[PDB]
Amino acid sequence: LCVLLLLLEPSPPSIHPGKSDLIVRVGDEIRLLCTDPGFVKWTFEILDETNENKQNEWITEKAEATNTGKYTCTNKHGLSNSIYVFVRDPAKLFLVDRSLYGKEDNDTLVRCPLTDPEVTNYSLKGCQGKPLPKDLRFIPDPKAGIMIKSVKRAYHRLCLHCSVDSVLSEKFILKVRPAFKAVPVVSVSKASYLLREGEEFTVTCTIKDVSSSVYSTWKRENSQTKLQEKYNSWHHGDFNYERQATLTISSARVNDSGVFMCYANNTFGSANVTTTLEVVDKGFINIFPMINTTVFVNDGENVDLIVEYEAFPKPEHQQWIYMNRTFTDKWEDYPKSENESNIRYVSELHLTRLKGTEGGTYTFLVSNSDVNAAIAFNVYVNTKPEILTYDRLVNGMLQCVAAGFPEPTIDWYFCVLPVDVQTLNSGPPFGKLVVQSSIDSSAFKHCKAYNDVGKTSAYFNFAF
Ligand SMILES: *[C@@H]1O[C@H](CO)[C@@H](O)[C@H](O)[C@H]1NC(C)=O
Ligand SMILES: *[C@@H]1O[C@H](CO)[C@@H](O)[C@H](O)[C@H]1NC(C)=O
Ligand SMILES: *[C@@H]1O[C@H](CO)[C@@H](O)[C@H](O)[C@H]1NC(C)=O
Ligand SMILES: *[C@@H]1O[C@H](CO)[C@@H](O)[C@H](O)[C@H]1NC(C)=O
Ligand SMILES: *[C@@H]1O[C@H](CO)[C@@H](O)[C@H](O)[C@H]1NC(C)=O
């Protein structure tokens, strides 16, 4: 009601005039009145603008367009009330904040509140000719602006105008920040390093993601340094970003070695890729026979001497030798895996149809720039005992000496059996054990070797 003409529960503050919004001609005075015995201030607020006035009556003599907005009366008891003031200007139907930014999946408010609400259709429209995309929603408000609903990444760098019944707006360029909808994609330049005390350790973690906000870090795993990374980053467009953080150690020392992990994280989720590094101070090699180093073969059969082994640096010399003489003729060689981390090899020596003669000791040799290493396979072959030598050192004692495999046992016969006078025999031959037995012959009246394989004989004769 109009206020008495005075000639001359705790309540919220009263305002005059008692209206919600008030249209006011440009250049005309804005006269607002607040009645509250415990009044404090009137706050005015268009867009980000803010202003205070500690006088119960707000008076602006020559209203401008900018003067359009929310007028809130507030009392000491914490309580308030507001009224909105539209200052219609035939010229300016929009005061604006061109700065438009939205976040994918959240709403956005275009800031073009109008200074005149006596208009018929508050809608959203085109840009430089063209109209709008479909699926796009907007719930407009004369007091706030127009709120584009549930922005899509697709709307990036879009341009648009404020619609109402038609009105000329000003130029806006939409900018959509993206939502993380996928863990970061992280990679390393090389998953593994075999190093030599003294050289330079280097690596580049590569992280690709949709926003400069991705969190990435290197992690010397048992944690001492955070020893600086050398960052650098690119932006391949709008939602494509990649950053490289190269890790380096000028002088690689044994102690260094461990797993360096590249961690990446974003509000969606996290991802890590690991690279292990081992630094050695001596070129090395160690072998691995794949069968007993001792081997037995039957007369006509075959064998494969196999052996794997670990070498770093890569080998540059390797052979098989039988009698102080190497091969060219019956052996294989090959990397175990053809990765980049392969330090491991394998060689086979294919002995075939080997006659009882091929018995002996076989050696495999291999070396790199720093070390040489080798191991020996003792190959015993089964063969018929050969009578090395028949002797007659005389107490009349007759001797007989043979070799073969397995060890050859010597039985004697007169013409029953004699006894023995001997025993073992330590060198070459290799892969053949030698037997030595003797008899006395001092008993009158007118030499057999054998083992699990064969039996040979030599013969003596004498007379009483
Ligand atoms: C936007 O806000 C809603 C809640 O209103 C939230 O759940 C949604 O995730 C937000 N959008 C994004 C992708 O941050
Ligand atoms: C990864 O991001 C999530 C989401 O904000 C956060 O809770 C967490 O602290 C982050 N962890 C790391 C390793 O930065
Ligand atoms: C690293 O990733 C592996 C493989 O997905 C996962 O099992 C582990 O939880 C991750 N570690 C950290 C600390 O994020
Ligand atoms: C075969 O090698 C094993 C050890 O790996 C050993 O115990 C054995 O003596 C060898 N074979 C024979 C019959 O000697
Ligand atoms: C190669 O790296 C190691 C060494 O050979 C092996 O264990 C692994 O299976 C291989 N991985 C790749 C790159 O396929």
Curated annotation (Swiss-Prot):
Numerous proteins are phosphorylated in response to KIT signaling, but it is not evident to determine which are directly phosphorylated by KIT under in vivo conditions. Residues 9-88, 97-177, 184-280, 289-382, 385-463 form the Ig-like C2-type domain. Monomer in the absence of bound KITLG/SCF. Homodimer in the presence of bound KITLG/SCF, forming a heterotetramer with two KITLG/SCF molecules. Interacts (via phosphorylated tyrosine residues) with the adapter proteins GRB2 and GRB7 (via SH2 domain), and SH2B2/APS. Interacts (via C-terminus) with MPDZ (via the tenth PDZ domain). Interacts (via phosphorylated tyrosine residues) with PIK3R1 and PIK3 catalytic subunit. Interacts (via phosphorylated tyrosine) with CRK (isoform Crk-II), FYN, SHC1 and MATK/CHK (via SH2 domain). Interacts with LYN and FES/FPS. Ubiquitinated by SOCS6. KIT is rapidly ubiquitinated after autophosphorylation induced by KITLG/SCF binding, leading to internalization and degradation. Induction: Up-regulated by cis-retinoic acid in neuroblastoma cell lines. It is linked to Piebald trait: Autosomal dominant genetic developmental abnormality of pigmentation characterized by congenital patches of white skin and hair that lack melanocytes. Gastrointestinal stromal tumor: Common mesenchymal neoplasms arising in the gastrointestinal tract, most often in the stomach. They are histologically, immunohistochemically, and genetically different from typical leiomyomas, leiomyosarcomas, and schwannomas. Most GISTs are composed of a fairly uniform population of spindle-shaped cells. Some tumors are dominated by epithelioid cells or contain a mixture of spindle and epithelioid morphologies. Primary GISTs in the gastrointestinal tract commonly metastasize in the omentum and mesenteries, often as multiple nodules. Glycans are attached at residues 106, 121, 255, 265, 272, 292, 324, 339, 425. This is Mast/stem cell growth factor receptor Kit. Belongs to the protein kinase superfamily. Tyr protein kinase family. CSF-1/PDGF receptor subfamily. Tyrosine-protein kinase that acts as a cell-surface receptor for the cytokine KITLG/SCF and plays an essential role in the regulation of cell survival and proliferation, hematopoiesis, stem cell maintenance, gametogenesis, mast cell development, migration and function, and in melanogenesis. In response to KITLG/SCF binding, KIT can activate several signaling pathways. Phosphorylates PIK3R1, PLCG1, SH2B2/APS and CBL. Activates the AKT1 signaling pathway by phosphorylation of PIK3R1, the regulatory subunit of phosphatidylinositol 3-kinase. The gene is KIT. It comes from Homo sapiens (Human). Disulfide bonds join 34-73, 112-162, 127-159, 205-262, 400-447. Residues 9-464 are extracellular.
